[PDB]
Amino acid sequence: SDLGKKLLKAARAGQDDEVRILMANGADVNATDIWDATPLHLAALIGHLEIVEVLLKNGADVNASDITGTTPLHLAATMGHKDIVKVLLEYGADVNAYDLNGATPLHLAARMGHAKIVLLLLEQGADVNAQDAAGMTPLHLAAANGHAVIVALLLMHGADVNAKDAAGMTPLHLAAANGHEEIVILLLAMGADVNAQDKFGKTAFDISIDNGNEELAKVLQDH
Amino acid sequence: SDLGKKLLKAARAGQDDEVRILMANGADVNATDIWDATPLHLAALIGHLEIVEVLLKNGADVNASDITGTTPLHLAATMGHKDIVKVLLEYGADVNAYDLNGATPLHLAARMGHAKIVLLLLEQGADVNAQDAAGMTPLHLAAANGHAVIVALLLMHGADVNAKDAAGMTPLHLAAANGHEEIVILLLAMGADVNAQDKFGKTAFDISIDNGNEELAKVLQDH
Amino acid sequence: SADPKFESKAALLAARGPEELLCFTERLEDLVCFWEEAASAGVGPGQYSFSYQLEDEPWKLCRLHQAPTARGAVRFWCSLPTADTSSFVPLELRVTAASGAPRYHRVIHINEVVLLDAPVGLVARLADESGHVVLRWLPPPETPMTSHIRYEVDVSAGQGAGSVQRVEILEGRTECVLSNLRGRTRYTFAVRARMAEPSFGGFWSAWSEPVSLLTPSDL
Amino acid sequence: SADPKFESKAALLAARGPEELLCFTERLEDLVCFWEEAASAGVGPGQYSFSYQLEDEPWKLCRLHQAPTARGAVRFWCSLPTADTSSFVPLELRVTAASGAPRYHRVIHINEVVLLDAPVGLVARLADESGHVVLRWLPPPETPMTSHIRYEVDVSAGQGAGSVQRVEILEGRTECVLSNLRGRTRYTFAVRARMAEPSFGGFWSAWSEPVSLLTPSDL
């Protein structure tokens, strides 16, 4: 079964023709490297829509997970390959699969700022309030990273505006810690709790004054 | 009745004490200049919360309109004086008053980018789909000006994502004409019509390719 | 007939506050108000009316000029007659469309809209004793009173990731010493000028010409 | 032990693609991969593992270095041994936390991640016949093959309102003539360099030192 190694190296090389030759020669479509990464992992990581379709049409495990908990949907969502994300979900990819950091594809897409993919994952039934190892929902990541569009997308799909992480910090805290005043207002418009403190005992107003963003602090102080 | 001229000049000078002296001396709180602008117009335009409260507590016409159709709420909403906007609405300011351009305070606040005031006006019952002389709703102005936060605020308060202006141009057209791809996605997530053309016969895709933003054109072409 | 010094300052403010009526004075005896808007049909300077009134004088009309901007929009502006510019009094400005529709309405104080030239002569050196960087510069050219100017220096590092640090400088201090810069790092420095409260007021000047420096090691 | 030339290029890419694993080569025989992240507790270079494999060699580990950035975050990086850097073949990169959790996973081609120095020697002049501005520059220093370099010049006007125009320059053209600039206007120009497709590929260089010019009247 030597061909399985050649398929993994061909898939990540994006070699369309060589993959089809190894496929037809009886190579294992679910071969794994030292990381338990399948050719579908490498095809999705490369961005080769043609090879992802070939591997999926030949029964590659869509929900294959390498020893880090990363699935092909995790990789396509991180890298921003909207076309490949659609085909993986087309083939029943677990939209709420989590890696060893507890992050779902909606976590990764939101952290990186792929607004189109955050929408597509939501449209395919992604858990909006999913929590990672830090207890952070995609809204936590989006609010900290300043992606106002993704923040609004998550909010209109039922995101908890007052979700607390392991530190007890809501998105209002994270938005105030990075000076995203525009997101502070968008969160407040959806019922963010100004009078909400973390385990450390500091509210969104307390973080802004500790960061020096008193401009944003007067915003929370009014309403 | 010479004092009415002195009150108008004191109000716009922000002279707290001189206003109180003229008030108590029987000056007309609704005096008008050559523009039919009342001292409440000039107080709101200055940003003097103290004088706006004094004039309102003494019966200044909250919905006074100068010969341009501009009311004090129009001026406070344009200039961004959130504190004065609250007090005017407190005193029953017509939230949907329109000037000679057909623009309501929600038009002006959205064009200028005052996210907090757009929220406050909405919270006080502003017509979200109000149309100006060009037939443009506040969402038109927000989508053209790239204010993603205000776009999301308007959208979650019942804004028509497919509202057409006099040219038959939806916010999707205006967002594509100024390269606000992030807003293009936010509008698409709320049911924007990619296959919608203006009176000139050009869709959101047709404007992007005419502007050269083929990056944004491939976004509408996928979905 | 194009004033490069005015059009430099004009585009500076325009990028800060778009779609706004922008007024400023350079020497406190002048006053220029301007705005920018997309080129629309045959709309020229005759399609707007610029009204201004101050103190007890009647409302006066100011002739508007127009010229396309480097980006393609049109810029309308009015240079008030020096006879009418008087500081420390309220000055009411109104721009009304030819139809009578509202366009702009503002109240300003000329002594609160000063826009200085940029500072000049920036120099950066490493102190001989400590690795501290010492910035020095000269007051903006032809500014009336340099004692009431306050500066702000920008510390940036590498392209696209600017404004690593902003340092407020006391009034009339033409010097700045930086003592927290990481070693073996190429920093770049510029400095703004503006009139100091409460006697006057205005807007930050354009940044000075920049000066780059490579900090020493062991820091 | 701090490399200013590398840290300049590193901060350049970092500002373009934050929270990403960023790899580039200067001379095609080297390869550096790096990322930046907030300083977190006692997490050092021993808390991540950098794995890389190419062709039929076994997966190899690269020792990670760390250093704080000018902004306060920490930057981890790995400089692959020149013996292992071979162009035109896929190179798989993996960063895994010490716990085994995923951090980064990328596949690159070294010949597709070239990051040149900036162009040097920019000069701008007005053509004698027409008011056109002629820009000229020199290829980036110590670049192997200047025939496969393509440039891009930026035309800006006034501070804060940059990138009035971007001009793509044909391969190996060290010249650019601008013929639509508005007259009596102070413009500023800079130029990038990058390797030309499809033989190579990479990222735009940092902008050259800029050059300003005041266009003539009657335009």
UniProtKB/Swiss-Prot annotation, chains C, D:
Outcome following mutation: residue 88 to A/L: Greatly reduced EPO binding
Keywords: Cell membrane, Congenital erythrocytosis, Disease variant, Disulfide bond, Glycoprotein, Isopeptide bond, Membrane, Phosphoprotein, Receptor, Secreted, Signal, Transmembrane, Transmembrane helix, Ubl conjugation
Topological domain ranges for the Extracellular compartment: 3-219
Effect noted on mutating residue 89 to A: 16-fold reduction in EPO binding
Compartment(s): Cell membrane
Residues under site feature: Required for ligand binding: 88
Source organism superkingdom: Eukaryota
Glycosylated residues (UniProt): 47
Motif WSXWS motif: where in chain: 204-208
Tissue: Erythroid cells and erythroid progenitor cells.
Outcome of substituting residue 150 to A: Little effect on EPO binding
Known outcome of mutating residue 88 to W: 60-fold reduction in EPO binding
Annotated GO MF terms: erythropoietin receptor activity; identical protein binding
Outcome when changing residue 147 to A: 16-fold reduction in EPO binding
Annotated effect of mutating residue 148 to A: Little effect on EPO binding
Domain comment (free text): The WSXWS motif appears to be necessary for proper protein folding and thereby efficient intracellular transport and cell-surface receptor binding. The box 1 motif is required for JAK interaction and/or activation.
Assembly description: Forms homodimers on EPO stimulation. The tyrosine-phosphorylated form interacts with several SH2 domain-containing proteins including LYN, the adapter protein SH2B2, PTPN6, PTPN11, JAK2, PI3 kinases, STAT5A/B, SOCS3, CRKL. Interacts with INPP5D/SHIP1. SH2B2 binding inhibits the JAK-STAT signaling. Interacts with RHEX; this interaction occurs in a erythropoietin (EPO)-dependent manner. Interacts with ATXN2L.
Protein name per Swiss-Prot or TrEMBL: Erythropoietin receptor
Species this chain originates from: Homo sapiens (Human)
Classification lineage: Eukaryota, Metazoa, Chordata, Craniata, Vertebrata
Shown segment, full-protein numbering: 32 to 248 of 508
